[PDB]
Design an enzyme around this catalytic site. Structure first.
Site, PDB file in Angstrom:
ATOM      1  N   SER A 151      83.600   0.243 -71.242  1.00 47.53           N
ATOM      2  CA  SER A 151      85.073   0.273 -71.483  1.00 47.53           C
ATOM      3  C   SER A 151      85.450  -0.769 -72.557  1.00 47.53           C
ATOM      4  CB  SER A 151      85.796   0.061 -70.172  1.00 47.53           C
ATOM      5  OG  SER A 151      87.125   0.493 -70.276  1.00 47.53           O
ATOM      6  N   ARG A 221      99.509  -0.526 -63.930  1.00 42.58           N
ATOM      7  CA  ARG A 221      98.208  -0.493 -63.196  1.00 42.58           C
ATOM      8  C   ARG A 221      98.104   0.814 -62.418  1.00 42.58           C
ATOM      9  NH1 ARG A 221      92.962  -2.192 -63.630  1.00 42.58           N
ATOM     10  NH2 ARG A 221      92.168  -2.772 -61.576  1.00 42.58           N
ATOM     11  N   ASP A 314      84.802  11.209 -66.758  1.00 43.86           N
ATOM     12  CA  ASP A 314      85.679  10.212 -67.434  1.00 43.86           C
ATOM     13  C   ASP A 314      86.836  10.943 -68.141  1.00 43.86           C
ATOM     14  OD1 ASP A 314      86.848   8.163 -69.074  1.00 43.86           O
ATOM     15  OD2 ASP A 314      84.875   7.147 -69.218  1.00 43.86           O
ATOM     16  N   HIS A 344      86.036   7.379 -65.159  1.00 40.98           N
ATOM     17  CA  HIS A 344      85.794   6.172 -65.993  1.00 40.98           C
ATOM     18  C   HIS A 344      85.277   5.003 -65.142  1.00 40.98           C
ATOM     19  CE1 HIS A 344      86.055   3.614 -69.410  1.00 40.98           C
ATOM     20  NE2 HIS A 344      86.798   2.726 -68.685  1.00 40.98           N
ATOM     21  N   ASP A 345      85.878   4.742 -63.978  1.00 39.56           N
ATOM     22  CA  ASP A 345      85.468   3.619 -63.097  1.00 39.56           C
ATOM     23  C   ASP A 345      84.017   3.776 -62.598  1.00 39.56           C
ATOM     24  OD1 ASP A 345      87.463   1.695 -63.341  1.00 39.56           O
ATOM     25  OD2 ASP A 345      88.425   2.281 -61.443  1.00 39.56           O
TER      26      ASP A 345
HETATM   27  N1  LIG Z   1      89.099  -0.701 -63.688  1.00 39.70           N
HETATM   28  C1  LIG Z   1      88.388  -1.435 -64.706  1.00 39.70           C
HETATM   29  C2  LIG Z   1      88.027  -0.489 -65.851  1.00 39.70           C
HETATM   30  C3  LIG Z   1      88.924  -0.603 -67.064  1.00 39.70           C
HETATM   31  O1  LIG Z   1      88.467   0.365 -68.022  1.00 39.70           O
HETATM   32  C4  LIG Z   1      89.225  -2.648 -65.052  1.00 39.70           C
HETATM   33  O2  LIG Z   1      90.315  -2.723 -64.494  1.00 39.70           O
HETATM   34  O3  LIG Z   1      88.797  -3.618 -65.711  1.00 39.70           O
END
Ligand SMILES: N[C@@H](CCO)C(=O)O
Ligand SMILES: N[C@@H](CCO)C(=O)O
EC number: 2.3.1.31
Lengths: 375, 366
Positions: A151, A221, A314, A344-345
């Site tokens: 990321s 968030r 993702d 993505h996570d």
């Molecule tokens: N959830 C992670 C991934 C961010 O891409 C963060 O909050 O750092």
């Protein structure tokens, strides 16, 4: 002039002095917070630079407590005989420039004795690499075996590989693209607007006022968490089910809704809104092609051996972006896909699958370093 | 007397009186705004109900001006020769229950003469169908040839078909699923929280105070607009290019950011925040299986001929949801796939491809 590494696991503060940013601003008296696992080899040829993502910090592995609000963001990935084998490697993580976990950011006191706040400059990913490079130089490290990140971490690793190809043996670039996309800038700039819309933002100068734009940050968030998740997995987990003993047809909450509220509140307990804004703008700024003739020219120029990982589900950095990286980097043998339902996570959740891509990266880094002769 | 239809193109206000809502709450003195195109047949048997989506209204077709902030949200779809051929069909569109363009919503005056605001009840898709049906009945219309809608309009179309199969001959359900998904509720409920976080929300009683939570609603609309786009099309259009001569490394805007600011600003000139919240909660409530043994039982119950359409690049109502619908509805011959780059909003942008599905719907109606 050199400063020691801190004791394994402990936060050290590396004072790097003034840093010239990409936009020409000189940022005085920068401090980068560092944590490390494993002993530094006598030739200093065994450094693995672990680059955290948007809400990460220097705390790669280990429990919460002793000043850490969370367990390591890649807990178990580093240690003796772990994918980052700290019996052979010295795993170093910074708190990124702009952060709120020990490094210089908007919450940090400026030379005038007040928080940077609205005076904190706009920084890029290249600024973050420059601060990390100066931190490593202050510790007497001039060369790194491997950069590894997902990321924002992947953006950091990639800019490091492209900017300093002569000073890095190999990289793992996970769950990122060569540049910010329209969708990513869309959601990042709207998350920032959410924070800046909160009355407690106070033009960014809320720090030490006893009021902070946490509600704006919780909204940002909630939207960011959805971009980080897998669509199907979310529906399998929550569907349209209500929260416990509540009736959504008369103003009660859905289970997914309650969950996003909780994720929002978690972040507000450990993370600074001003840092959120500065790092989200840095993410919007990501472009390995800037000043290099664009993404194709930048990547075709880079001779470094690179493992590139993407996650199937993702929705924020979709797989087409890691396909493009893999195809254009001449040192990338081809794309690795993490078959994860977690979106993505998945680069944080799938520690076994990401564990294997890290092992191959460092296998590669060891062979390359053994065959790399430098002062 | 029945209420007469308005002249073609003109807004009529159909008073339907008190309406009993699914949560039990009774909403008094409901008005539903209507517009229509084409003549009502002598037998009143040629109505095609056009069901708008989240920020649409009764204005399906024609230019902006003369009391209309925008052109038709489906311009050209209804008219002589058109997919809804007004030489044969009577195209009728309501402003939905909860809306802000003529129908009873949070901004409308309650019986005590003050805006409904925070007193406005939580409504469902099923309540929206009951209100539209009451409007049609007041106009002397008890049967419809077809219902057609995408998104919130698809939800309305589906609930209509499934609740009242004896009163519709055929349906077009575009770009929706049988029930709200966790992702849809996530984004919908967070868009609502963004509006309620704006201090101008004033508990939902901002109407008439001279402060509205338009900032909150702009934020919500910016996030919602991204869920409506094709990811690849959006990047092909803007990439990370700057706005004009602005420099994003010293605080200038990206072209996409500027486009999103325009989207929020445009909606703020034409749309009420309270309606945004109320319709967003009805979308979260979408569940054709509620009280009916769940989604499979409800859909397998429906004998109506239905055309189910899905957009390949849809990221908010992904095409697996329309494949589920196409499969379970016995009257569906299979999924109609709209090959578009334009995402969810494909159902509004692709008027030619959607035009074809409408014609096939009206063929089935007969
Ligand atoms: N959830 C992670 C991934 C961010 O891409 C963060 O909050 O750092
Ligand atoms: N973009 C359209 C459809 C979204 O579902 C609207 O605002 O109504």
């Amino acid at each position: 002039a050199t400063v020691p590494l801190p004791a394994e696991g402990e936060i050290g503060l590396v004072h790097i002095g003034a840093l010239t940013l990409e936009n020409g601003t000189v940022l005085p008296d920068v401090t980068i917070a560092v944590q490390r696992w494993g002993e530094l080899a006598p030739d200093r040829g065994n450094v693995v630079m672990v680059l955290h993502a948007l809400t990460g910090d220097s705390h790669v592995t280990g429990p919460a407590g002793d000043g850490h609000p969370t367990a390591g963001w890649w807990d178990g990935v580093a240690g003796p005989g772990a994918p980052i084998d700290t019996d052979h490697w010295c795993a170093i993580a910074t708190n990124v420039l702009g952060g709120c976990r020990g490094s210089t950011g908007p919450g940090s006191l400026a030379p005038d004795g007040k928080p940077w706040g609205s005076r904190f400059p706009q920084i890029t990913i290249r600024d973050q690499v420059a601060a990390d490079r100066a931190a490593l130089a202050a510790l007497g490290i001039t060369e790194v075996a491997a950069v590894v990140g997902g990321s924002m971490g992947g953006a950091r690793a990639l800019e490091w590989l492209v900017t300093h190809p002569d000073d890095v043996r190999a990289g793992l670039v996970l769950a990122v693209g060569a540049r910010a996309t329209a969708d990513q800038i869309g959601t990042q700039s709207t998350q920032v607007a959410a924070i800046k819309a909160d009355p407690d933002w106070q033009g960014g100068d809320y720090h030490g006022t006893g009021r902070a734009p946490t509600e704006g940050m919780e909204i940002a968030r909630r939207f960011a968490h959805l971009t980080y998740r897998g669509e199907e997995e979310l529906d399998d987990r929550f569907a349209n089910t209500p929260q416990d003993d509540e009736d959504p047809l008369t103003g009660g909450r859905y289970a997914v809704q309650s969950y996003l509220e909780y994720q929002g509140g978690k972040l507000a307990r450990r993370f600074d809104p001003g840092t959120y804004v500065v790092l989200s703008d840095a993410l919007s700024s990501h472009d390995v092609g800037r000043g290099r003739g664009g993404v194709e020219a930048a990547l075709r120029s880079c001779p470094v051996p690179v493992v590139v990982g993407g996650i199937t589900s993702d929705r924020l950095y979709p797989i087409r972006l890691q396909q493009e990286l893999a195809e254009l980097l001449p040192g990338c043998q081809g794309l690795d896909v993490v078959d994860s339902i977690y979106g993505h996570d998945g680069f944080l959740v799938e520690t076994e699958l990401v564990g294997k891509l890290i092992r191959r990266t460092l296998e590669l880094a060891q062979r390359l370093e053994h065959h790399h002769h430098h002062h």
